[PDB]
Every structure is written in structure tokens, then in C-alpha cells.
Amino acid sequence: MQIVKKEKFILKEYTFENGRTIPVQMGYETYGTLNRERSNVILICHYFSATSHAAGKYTAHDEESGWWDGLIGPGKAIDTNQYFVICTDNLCNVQVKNPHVITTGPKSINPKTGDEYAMDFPVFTFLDVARMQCELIKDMGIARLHAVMGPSAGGMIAQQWAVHYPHMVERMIGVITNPQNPIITSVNVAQNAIEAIRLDPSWKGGKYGEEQPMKGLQLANRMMFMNAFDEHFYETTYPRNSIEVEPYEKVSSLTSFEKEINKLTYRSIELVDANSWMYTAKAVLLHDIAHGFSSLEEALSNVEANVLMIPCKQDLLQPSRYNYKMVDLLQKQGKYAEVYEIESINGHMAGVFDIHLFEKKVYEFLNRKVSS
Amino acid sequence: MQIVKKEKFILKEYTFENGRTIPVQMGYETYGTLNRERSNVILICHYFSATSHAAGKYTAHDEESGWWDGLIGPGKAIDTNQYFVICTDNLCNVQVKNPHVITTGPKSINPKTGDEYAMDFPVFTFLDVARMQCELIKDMGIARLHAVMGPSAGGMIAQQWAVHYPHMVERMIGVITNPQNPIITSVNVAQNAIEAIRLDPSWKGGKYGEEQPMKGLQLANRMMFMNAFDEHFYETTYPRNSIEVEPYEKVSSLTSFEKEINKLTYRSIELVDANSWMYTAKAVLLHDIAHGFSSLEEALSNVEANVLMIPCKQDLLQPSRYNYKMVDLLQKQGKYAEVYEIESINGHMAGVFDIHLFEKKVYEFLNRKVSSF
Amino acid sequence: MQIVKKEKFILKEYTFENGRTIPVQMGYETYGTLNRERSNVILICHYFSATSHAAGKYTAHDEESGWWDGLIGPGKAIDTNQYFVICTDNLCNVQVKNPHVITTGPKSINPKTGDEYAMDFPVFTFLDVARMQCELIKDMGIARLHAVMGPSAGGMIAQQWAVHYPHMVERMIGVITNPQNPIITSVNVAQNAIEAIRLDPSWKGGKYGEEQPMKGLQLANRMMFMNAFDEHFYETTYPRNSIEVEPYEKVSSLTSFEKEINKLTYRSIELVDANSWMYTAKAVLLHDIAHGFSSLEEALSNVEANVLMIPCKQDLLQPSRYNYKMVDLLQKQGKYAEVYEIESINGHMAGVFDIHLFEKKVYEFLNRKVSSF
Amino acid sequence: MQIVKKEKFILKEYTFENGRTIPVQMGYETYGTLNRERSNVILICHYFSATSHAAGKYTAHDEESGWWDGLIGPGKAIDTNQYFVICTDNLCNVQVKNPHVITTGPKSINPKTGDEYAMDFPVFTFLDVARMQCELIKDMGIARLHAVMGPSAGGMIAQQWAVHYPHMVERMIGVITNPQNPIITSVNVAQNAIEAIRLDPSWKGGKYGEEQPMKGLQLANRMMFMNAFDEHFYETTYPRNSIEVEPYEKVSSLTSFEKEINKLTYRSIELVDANSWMYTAKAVLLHDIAHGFSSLEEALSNVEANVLMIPCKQDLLQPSRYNYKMVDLLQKQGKYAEVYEIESINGHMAGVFDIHLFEKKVYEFLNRKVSS
Secondary structure: OOOOOOEEEEEEEEEOOOOOEEEEEEEEEEEOOOOOOOOOEEEEOOOOOOOOOOOOOOOOOOOOOOOOOOOEEOOOOEEOOOOEEEEEOOOOOOOOOOOOOOOOOOOOEEOOOOEEOHHHOOOOOHHHHHHHHHHHHHHOOOOOEOEEEEEOHHHHHHHHHHHHOHHHEOEEEEEOOOOEOOHHHHHHHHHHHHHHHHHOHHHHHHOOOOOOOHHHHHHHHHHHHOOOOOHHHHHHHOOOOOOOOHHHOOOOOOOHHHHHHHHHHHHOOOOOOHHHHHHHHHHHHHOEOOOOOOOHHHHHHOOOOEEEEEOEOOOOOOOOHHHHHHHHHHHHOOOOEEEOOEOOOOHHHHHHHOHHHOHHHHHHHHHOOOOO | OOOOOOEEEEEEEEEOOOOOEEEEEEEEEEEOOOOOOOOOEEEEOOOOOOOOOOOOOOOOOOOOOOOOOOOEEOOOOEEOOOOEEEEEOOOOOOOOOOOOOOOOOOOOEOOOOOOEOHHHOOOOOHHHHHHHHHHHHHHOOOOOEOEEEEEOHHHHHHHHHHHHOOOOEOEEEEEOOOOEOOHHHHHHHHHHHHHHHHHOHHHHHHOOOOOOOHHHHHHHHHHHHOOOOOHHHHHHHOOOOOOOOHHHOOOOOOOHHHHHHHHHHHHOOOOOOHHHHHHHHHHHHHOEOOOOOOOHHHHHHOOOOEEEEEOEOOOOOOOOHHHHHHHHHHHHOOOOEEEOOEOOOOHHHHHHHOHHHOHHHHHHHHHOOOOOO | OOOOOOEEEEEEEEEOOOOOEEEEEEEEEEEOOOOOOOOOEEEEOOOOOOOOOOOOOOOOOOOOOOOOOOOEEOOOOEEOOOOEEEEEOOOOOOOOOOOOOOOOOOOOEOOOOOOEOHHHOOOOOHHHHHHHHHHHHHHOOOOOEOEEEEEOHHHHHHHHHHHHOOOOEOEEEEEOOOOEOOHHHHHHHHHHHHHHHHHOHHHHHHOOOOOOOHHHHHHHHHHHHOOOOOHHHHHHHOOOOOOOOHHHOOOOOOOHHHHHHHHHHHHOOOOOOHHHHHHHHHHHHHOEOOOOOOOHHHHHHOOOOEEEEEOEOOOOOOOOHHHHHHHHHHHHOOOOEEEOOEOOOOHHHHHHHOHHHOHHHHHHHHHOOOOOO | OOOOOOEEEEEEEEEOOOOOEEEEEEEEEEEOOOOOOOOOEEEEOOOOOOOOOOOOOOOOOOOOOOOOOOOEEOOOOEEOOOOEEEEEOOOOOOOOOOOOOOOOOOOOEEOOOOEEOHHHOOOOOHHHHHHHHHHHHHHOOOOOEOEEEEEOHHHHHHHHHHHHOHHHEOEEEEEOOOOEOOHHHHHHHHHHHHHHHHHOHHHHHHOOOOOOOHHHHHHHHHHHHOOOOOHHHHHHHOOOOOOOOHHHOOOOOOOHHHHHHHHHHHHOOOOOOHHHHHHHHHHHHHOEOOOOOOOHHHHHHOOOOEEEEEOEOOOOOOOOHHHHHHHHHHHHOOOOEEEOOEOOOOHHHHHHHOHHHOHHHHHHHHHOOOOO
16 A cells, blocks of 8 residues: 555644643544545554554555554455545653654643653543544544544543444444453553652653663563463463573573563663653553443443454453453443454464454454444 | 533434334433442432433532532432432423533434424323433443432323332332323413414424524413412512502503513523423323323332322422322322322422422431332 | 393493593393382492393393302392392403493494504403493482492402492402402413413404404413312313323324313303403403502501402412401401301302302391491 | 475384384374485474474465474474474374374274274384384484474473484483373373273274264363363463353253363364374373383483473473473483473463474574584
């Protein structure tokens, strides 16, 4: 497909769910063509550490394609010959040093003061993201989405669309996600990550400038990486060396696997900002479609979209049992909802790397008609 | 209390008791906290010209609170530190121009045509309202109501709950209401009001758009207002001026009492929709819990809730003798049922304005144990 | 009784209380025989929709007798072997098409123009009727009335006699009436009726000629009818049908009670004139014996007749509490005055249909001696 | 003025005050000219033994003029240059053998049976006469009378017009008459006359054919003649002869005055019918404007005409005190009423013979305006 052009949406003022009001900017990109009646729109929401680059390439010499490139494009499951596909940068995008990212977050200058917001930036939830995207959708004269979809945090944003803009969502597909962030993941990955970043003395109250608290940030990144796959993936990809003697002789002497994983996890945080990681982890920890309602049932009663949940059985971050519970509750309200569970040694990351496992189901779901 | 949030419930298709099927929506709002067992829910139903706003405020600068605020809240008779309280907007809500109201009615757009339903809107009953509320309650994951209650039309809905969802209602409290709309009220206030609106040429067959038939509507509103209190209330509140001569000079010169009452009744139809008023008047005139059944006795045989009826002895719209009849029938079936009759110069409106006369009874009743299974 | 002869009384010019001067006529009829002293005269005044025909028949093949026939005649409570009884047609008599009625009103020709007065007719009160009757009584050579009496509007006229011709009235009996038309009735039944007729486009500003505005008039008539009895009367006489489904299907489908009541109320406006109805409703709404004076107390200070008030406890049009107030004021002035309250499911209409409830009292009162001079 | 032409009005059926229904015919005559708007009509009603011939002549050689000829004619008090004047024959007119009289009475043939009504004829009152005249007035398209007037019985008829057709009568003039026939006249002239006629064996139950009961009829006529003037009129017109001896010698021998009066009273009954005299005397005896009302006051309350009563002080048949009482009652009802009393040795007959005594008052009354 065509080289993708990065775009920028501005909002002079946006009011957060907690009442705070500030200007916001938001990168986005689109693939395919918006039809005459604007009825072919699919909105993709990106996961924790990703960006709006769901598909394609910015230049012809890009080493890689966008993170869901296997699903999106001409003749693929999300066929850009039929649909107009949008993807946006989340608020507090963690890759603030990525040259293609356009976001507002703790590194943004506060126009009232000339300085970085830092920890004065407002707490945001994935409802906040949904509402901001919705301003872009309306500004483009679009009234209904044919589908809203995404993996993990992207799936959280998508669930918020389904609950808070019921009229606007024909279909909702939540890959490797859940209606409420599990307690285990909330503490063990979100809370522990926030506290690792704050414990690093280089954090300096959140006023660290460009000198990132890298040790804390690497620790945060490592906790997430070490639950992103099946147990057995680590066992065979970073195998124990039973011969090596140096790790047995000083506490600080690392094993071969520790060094491999150190190198990967340091690499993936080079473009990342620590305060932004914190805010994003806070949004994940707060993720709860039932917040502001008296039960999960009442919140789900708002949903009018057809719903497809695609969990992975080996997913340690997002246990699939809560997909079944949600879908059961939707069906008892007489709504169309299904779970399509996949299996993979990639665990959670199956939702991003193992497209072949569910592309056909996505395709079929996107073509299935919705009750008026 | 915490500031109240309006919510919205939708059904893609609802089938009315007369068989018509259309999409419907319904505003609602809640107060207090649902307990783990979901055993502390009280559903409040609103009266003719009101809305879901039974208590509290939507902003801290609201001049007024909701219409039963004195009964509902922290430490009050319907104690929101203990109960999760729900209230919903009725179909064809008359305050259709009020932006806090979410309803389906003659002003709503028919999706099949893009035009307003107008007089193509289906006839509804208070049983239709109870069926919609029940979908919402079920969809919220609630199996049983600790109580259902309301004044007047609100009590009509509560009675339809008690009759038609007997495994779900522990307690029913019906304030200034009756099991069957009295004939006197059905003609003098519902039929006459409907006909007054139709008679106005501005009504234009129901297609008046944004220009309400104000003469017909004011007349409809004045008929209800003039039965809302005891007779002596009007005699002392808008007393006769025995000196003014101008009313004695032309048929069209109004007395001062006519002027005061015209002013009040005009003011209260400012946000109101005429067609909506007709459909709601029609619902009131059709109100009959025996409809469906072979008799009132049969309709009541199904009730298993503890029942409390609170009429006002001076109510001209809802004569209290039929509360006694109903309670008597329920007692002879071996059910728990009582009348607690209040007295007030306010007549019918005692049920909304003289909370002090019955709040202690409500409280006691909400705490009495369920007699049946 | 002997067949009754209609008579006619004319005034070439009469000046109304509002100062308008026009020629007027007034039908009347009499029963019994005037004694030599002319001391046995009882004047009967008729109610809203009636006529001078208080008793007997105009031909021996009349289906019905006059509206108080059970009280008036040989050996009856108002015994025509003993009393000379008179009754007259009121101004703006509504039964203007009835050929036995002789009245002046909006259908009458204005002699200055040759056209009907229509809404140029002057506003009248029941004091205007009393002033006309008095001219007739005087012109017949009668100085004093043994009694003046009537039900409802008829009682309003009788009260105006007692207040304004105190040297002429020995006894006043006011049945199902009040000294001041209650505010509730003045608005709910007089103002609303007047406005219902004006709202009908057929009314054509009062110039409808021979084509009466039947929708407006029927609505006016139904409002009065629905307050004429006790509430329970309507509940048992036009009971709800809990089986019929058609009313539940269209706004415009009537219930069976609506059909029965429509039929009755249509029938009774067949001989009736709309403008006439308005003027008479206006008279009722203006009724106030204190008008003129500084207070009700002052108006009543002038009464020297023995006074008997006969309200009905279930009367919704004329609440009996104001009969007690009036009688109390008269007693504290040292006058002879009493309330004899009846009870009946017939409500207001007990005063015309349940003669048996008070005929014995009337008789006793007509025979008690005058207390004042 | 012009020779008068006698006319005839027919009524196919007339219903009497007592309910009897029979065809009727009624002679009348008119003088002057009916104006465009028919507002100049004066109706004259004739007295006991008279006819419609109030004025003028039937032929140029008539020995006499009509009985009120002095009041009626060009330039007279009842000016035929301005007014259209009507006079009719009363029901049961006593002059049935007068060639100019057209009446219905006891000598009329009953069309149902081919015979004279005789005593089967209905009792009539002067209201009956008023109602019949009114049928003629309406048949001529006349709506109001400018005046209705007459002497004695004619005045009774006029009072009935005033009471029973109030709308139609602007002015009422009653000469030598009364609202109720006095008891004295009712017995002494009406009753005694009826009984004298019935006592005559020639009456034969009222079936006497043409052989009139002349003795009874002369006796009836004489009683009326002997009260028609002042006492002193008889004393000087038929004076006592103090020389005559024959009356002193047999009971049946008559005095000179008895013979004079015998000759006059026999002459005046030559054209008269006895049953008709009876019915007319009965109407006089029944004359009571209060009949069918509860008092004289109530009856008078109907009168809307201006009223002029012209009694004669010496009138023995119609004592003038009752004119004053009537007029007093009318004035207390706020009506325009007056008594204009005349004096004359002619007594009752002054109303017919002494026109000069009140012509000027009649004239003035006819010109005085009436309140609408």
C-alpha cells in the first residue's frame, strides 16, 4: 500500500474526566479511503508502548512495518480496499523521543507557565483517550464506526468507546484485553513499575529533565516483558547455561540469560520517557469500565455494539476467564457477544505477533451484519 | 448527597402491550450504593408532569432539588446510606423540552421515516413503563426489589410491578393513588384535557411542530390544577375580591382569582409538550390493574409484596375509599396490606408536599419483614 | 293540579347592575290561589339549565312534570291548597330554543339594530334577576313574600332577595347553594366552560347563528355533569369495563364509560344556546352576595328573613362548609338561621332529585313564625 | 266623506276562549287610507246594540250617519285625512235583521247540522271579539294599532286588546266603560234581561224561529234604556201628567210616560234577535279583564299602551269610580294612564251623544307620543 503520512489533530481545550482542562495534540494516521456516506470507518487503538503506526511504512526504506501490518492492508482481514482505517497516538505516549510521535503528556510544555507539566500533568484514563479520539472522528464528519478495535490497552480504549458512545459503535473487537484490569496485573506490572521508577534517585521528584531514571525504567520494562509471553517461551529463548561459573562467584555477576534480557529491555526503553510510562501504567491500573456505575452489568447494559473478545489462553497479563464472564453478562442482556480464544507459546503477545490465529475470525466478524 | 448523574437506558426494540414494536430510550438516575447481595434496591416511580429527578441536584447551583427530596437521602425515611434508590423517566414524558429528560414519545423521531411520530405514537399504559423499568433492573443484575413506590401515576406504575412481577417485589408503597383510575377523574381530568387540546385549532392534527397549542394546553393544565388540592385551599389561596367592578362589566374581564390561577397554569406549561400531555392523560385514563384479568380480585391475587397504601382523605383526584377496598381484598387473601390515611388542606398534593405526614410510616414499612415468600 | 298557563312580563327599559339599559321580558307561571291579604306568596327560583316550570304540566300529555314537582302541589311540602307559588324564567335562559321559555339574552333581537345582541349582550348577575322578579311581584300588587327559595343558581337569586329586599322577605330557603360561588367551582366549571366554548372555532366570535358550537358546548356541559353527583355515583353508574381492548389501541378510541357519558351530555345540549350558556356561567362565577358591601358580614347584616340552608354533604359544586359559616354569622347577629344538611350519593343533584330527604323540613319551616319584624 | 262600503271577513275556523271551534263571519267597514308603513290604524269597537257603522253613510239618502260620526271624518278628532279607521260587527250582534249586519251568533246555521245554533251557540266574551278582530288586522298586514277605542262594550273590547295583545296597542281609549262589569249593572241589566227573555213563554227554550219573545225582549230593552241617562233626563223628557184619571182606575191602564217609553223601547227592538241579546248580555256580565289572572293588578301589568279613560259622572251603568282605581293601579306600575271625566244629563249616553265634551281630549291623546 501507499506510504503512510503522519497527521496531527489539535484540540484547543480538552476537559479530562477528572475536570482538568488543557490543550491537547494527537498524532494519527489513516489507511484506505473514506466512502461517500462515511460508513466504512474502522478505528484501531494502540497498546501500551506502541504508537499510531498500526500498519504500513513512513518511507520505502523503513526496516519494519506498523505493529498490526499483517491484519491491515489490501486484501487482508481489515481490508483497506473496503475500509477507511484510523489509528491515533495515545495521550502520554511513552515514546516521546520517537520522531513520529505526536502527543500531550508530562513532557509537554504547559502554555500557562512555559514549563513541562511533569507531575502536574492530569491523571488520564482510557475513557479520556476514547473521548479525544471521538473529537477527531466528529471533526471528520463521521457519525458511526463500522468497528472499533485494539489489543490490550487498545482493547481497553475500544471497550470505553462501546460503553460511552453506544450509538456510534457497530462492532467492538477486544484482543488480549479485559473489562477491568486484573488485580494481579494492576499490582505486579502497573504499581510495581510506578514504584520502581519513583525509587530511582534519578527520578528527582519527576523533574529529571532529559537524564531519564533508566534503572527504574528498565526494571519497569523488564517486569512487563517477563509476563508478555508463555513461561516456556523464556525457558527456551533465553536458556539456562549450566556450565558458566562466574555467576556462582559474585552476587553482582550475571547469568547469560540475565544479560540477554538486560540487553533487550534496555534497548526498548531508549526512546521512552519515564513520567509518561508512569501515567500510562496508572491508566492501565485504573482501567475499569464499571467505574462510575453500580456494577459491571449496568456498565455493560450501555453496550449496543456486537462484541468479539479474542483472549489468549497462555496470557499471563490478561487472564481470559474475565472475557467469558463479560460475554456471558452481555448475552444475558440479549446482546450479540462472543469469545474466540487463541493459544500460543507467545502468550499475551500472540495478540500482536500471531495474527494468523484469528485473522479469519476478524474478517468474518467485520462482515457479519448488526441489528439496527 | 453527592451530585446526581443522569444515565440512559436503551432498547433497540420494545413491544408495547398493544403489540406495537419500536425502539425506546429511558433516562434514569440512582442514589446511594448497591450492596454485594443487591438486596437493598428501591425503585421510585414519578408522577404525571415530573421526571426521574426524585432527589438531589444535578449541579450544586440548582435552585431546587428533586421532587421527593425530603423523603430520600442520608438519614431520611428512604435512607440512601442504606438503600440503592433508582428512578426513571416515564414514556411520553411531558417535560420533553427539559434537557435532563430522556424519553420516547410523540416528539421522538421515527427511525423508519425520519419524521416525528406525532399521533402515530403508540398508546402506552403504566404497565408498559413497568416492563421497561424491569428490563433495566434485570440488566443491572438485580433480581429483587426491596420496595417499589411512587405517588399518583408513580403509584400506578408501582402497582403494575406488584401485580405483574410478584417474584421480584418485596414491598409496594402506593401514595395518593388507586388500583383503577376513578371514572370521575378519567373523564373530568383525562378525557376533558385530551379534548381541550384537540379543540384548539393550533393543535393542527398533532403536527404543530414547535408552536404548542397553548390555549388548549393551559385549559388541560388548569383542569388538573383545580383538582390537585382541597377545595378550601383555593378559597383561601386565591380569595374572592368583593370590591373589583371590572369583571361585572364584560364577559371577558377576568376576576383576580382567575388572573392568579391563569398566571400559575401558564407558567407550568412552558416546557411542556401537548401531544405528550395527551398520551400521558390517555395512560392515566386507561389505568386499571384489573385490565387483563377477570376482575380486580383476580389481579390482586397475584400480589405477594407487603402492601402499604397512603391516600389523602381530601384527595379529589384519587378518592381514598378504593384504597380501603383493595387492602380489604388483599387481607382476605391472607396477604399483608394496610392503609395509612393522611389529612391535609393540600389534598392530592399532600403526597408530594407533606412528606412529614407519612415519612415515619414509610421508614417503619421499609424495615418490616416480608410476610409471604 | 290544574294545567299550568305560561305568562309573560315585560319591562320597556330595565337598567342592569352594570348600568346597561335595554328592554327585557321574562316568562313566568303560578300555581294555587292568591289570598285576599296577598300574604301567601312563595317565589321559586330556577337553577342553571332549567326554566320557570317548577311544577305541573303545560298539557295533560306532557311526558314529564316540572323540575320540583315532588315538592310543589296539593297536599305537598309547598302546599298549593295554601300558597300562591310563582316561578320565573331567568335572564339568558339556556333553553332558548324551547318554545315555552320567555327570556332576554344573546339570542334576543336588539331593537336599536334589528340584529341579535350576541356578545354585545350585557353581563348579568343573579341580583339583576332578583330586581326583575321584584318588579313583577310589585306590579302584581304583592308587598311581601311568605318565602323565597330555590336550588343552586335558584338559591343564589333567593339569597339576593334576602339581602336586597329585606322588608319583603319573611323566609328564605337556599337549597344546594352558597353565598359566594366557591373559587373551585368558579374556575373548574364556569371559567373552563366559557373558555371551552370560545376555543371551538365554530363559535365564530359569538356569531354562529343557528349552528351551535357543539364540541365546545358538550365539553362545557360535561364539566358541569361530572361535578353534579358524588364521585361514587359515576363509579357505579358508568363502571369501568376491564375487558374491552379497543381503547388501548388508539388515542381516539373511547372507553365504554366515555361513550355512555358522551351520549348523555350530547343529548342535554340539544335545545341549548352556547352564548346563553356562557352568560349564565359568567353569572354563576360572579355570584357574591358580599359584592357591593365591605364584607360578607355586612351583606348579611341586612337579612331579616328567617333563613334555612339545605346543603348536601357530598356536593362537590357547593361545599357545605360555607353554609355553616353564613348561618353562624347570622346567628351572631341575633337572627334566626339554620342548616339542615342532607346526604346522598346524588351529591349536588340531591337538591332536585331527593326531595324526600328535606320536604318535611321545608314544610315545618314554611310554618314557623317570622322571628324579626 | 265617501260613501262607506260594507265588507265581510271570513274565518274558516275560530277557537273560542272556552275551546269551542266553529267558522265565523264578521262585517266591517273602514274610513280613510292605510299608509305605506301601515302605522296609521285606529280600531273602533262598537257598543251593545250598535254595529260596525261608526261613521258616514251607506247611501247618499241615508236618514242618519254612523253612531260616532261626530268624532270620525275629515278634520275631526279622529281625522280620516290622517288615520285609517276600522270598525267591525261584534259576534252575536243583536241586530240580526238589520240588512247591513254580518255576524255569527245563535241565528247562524251550524254547517255540521243544517240548523240554527240557538242555545248550542258557544258563550263568548269580549276577548273572543278582540281575538277575532285581530285576525282581520293581521290578514290586512297590520302589526301595530295607533289606537284601539270604543264606548261601553266597545271599551271592554278595547281593554282586552290592551291586555292580551300588548305589543300591538300604542293607545287605548275607553269611553263610558270599566275593567270589570259592575255587580249592580251585571245583575240589574244583564242578568235581569236574560231572565226576562227566558220567562217569556214565546222564548220556547230558545227555539222560537222568527216569532221573537217580544214581551221579554222589550222588558230587557227597557231595563237598559232606563239606566242609560241621568235620572233627571227621564223626569223632564217623559214628564208626569198630574191630570190624567184613567191610570187611577185600572191596574192595566198606563200613564202617559209609560206609553211614551213603551213606544220607544218597542221600536228599538224591531230588528233585534232575543237569543243574540242574551249572549251579548252574558258577555257583558262576564266582562272581567282579571279573569284568568290572580288580580286586577297582574292583568293590568300586561298593558303597555298609553291609556285614557273617559267616564261620565252621571253614568248609572258604568260608575266612574272604577276608572280612577284602574288608572291609579296603572300609574303605580309606572305606566301612562289618565281619567278625563265628563258631565251630562245624558249620563251613560253622553259617551255617544256628547262628543263635543271630549273630542278635543281624544285629538290631543291621539297625537301624544308613546314610549317605544
